[PDB]
């Protein structure tokens, strides 16, 4: 009753990529992300290694150091907003999330309506995450930047 | 293969072990010392314990931590200091770094007994956040601390 799934999970590049959203969350350290008071939801991305991950992460492990930009398109008003989700941890493990202003957005067009959510994923090497490339203990190349799309209906803050 | 270092510590809800292998070719090329100019690849295995106080499931890797190392040739008294960087190999993510021992031209870091010190700071310091709301929140991270290890260096393993 507090967590709202978005679309269905995608399984590409050795990871299950799922989206959900909550009420806006108070997150420390404060100041990095939108204050909970100024947001309407807290969009999150649940990304974990699939069985037989091609990059050395055991099944179920959280895929870290990923660069994830997002785009929220209200297809009914045509309004679009961009951003990036941030690594953090909660009651149920690490994830990428962000507090997002929906109806409280000043520019307008982000209230009740149908939505097209896109995650733009870039591999961890962008942030210097290392990768053994020796013959014995090396893992294969990371995926190239890709995107996944979900559809959902926004009806306000998860009450 | 994998040479263990000392015995694994357990504190602050973490499994903390120390290992070192032969020098490793790591990409992107340029962030860590080249394996050609290093004698060992020092690694640090850190995973969440059962009932982790910061919301990490049992066995999960602990990411975004800042683990600074120190190696002290107790025979020569030489002191080496640096950082371990996050990476991944054939058997999961970890923090590692290639270190120049005998090949370090400043000398004093050859064979002998060593003192390994892990300076560990919690993931916040790298912008990693945490929920602090009443429903999904988790407890505060640990304060900076240190775990010390015991190993006798014989050269590059093989
Ligand atoms: Cu979050
Ligand atoms: Cu390594």
From TrEMBL, chain B:
Mn(2+) 1 binds at residues 2, 43, 45, 91. Cu(+) binds at residues 41, 87, 94, 131. Fe(2+) binds at residues 2, 43, 91. Belongs to the UPF0423 family. It comes from the Bacteria. Fe(3+) binds at residues 2, 43, 91. The keyword Ion transport does not apply. Gene3D superfamilies: Periplasmic metal-binding protein Tp34-type (2.60.40.2480). This is Iron transporter. Pfam families: Iron_transport (PF10634). Cu(2+) binds at residues 41, 43, 87, 94, 131. Keywords: Metal-binding, Signal, Zinc. Mn(2+) 2 binds at residues 43, 45.
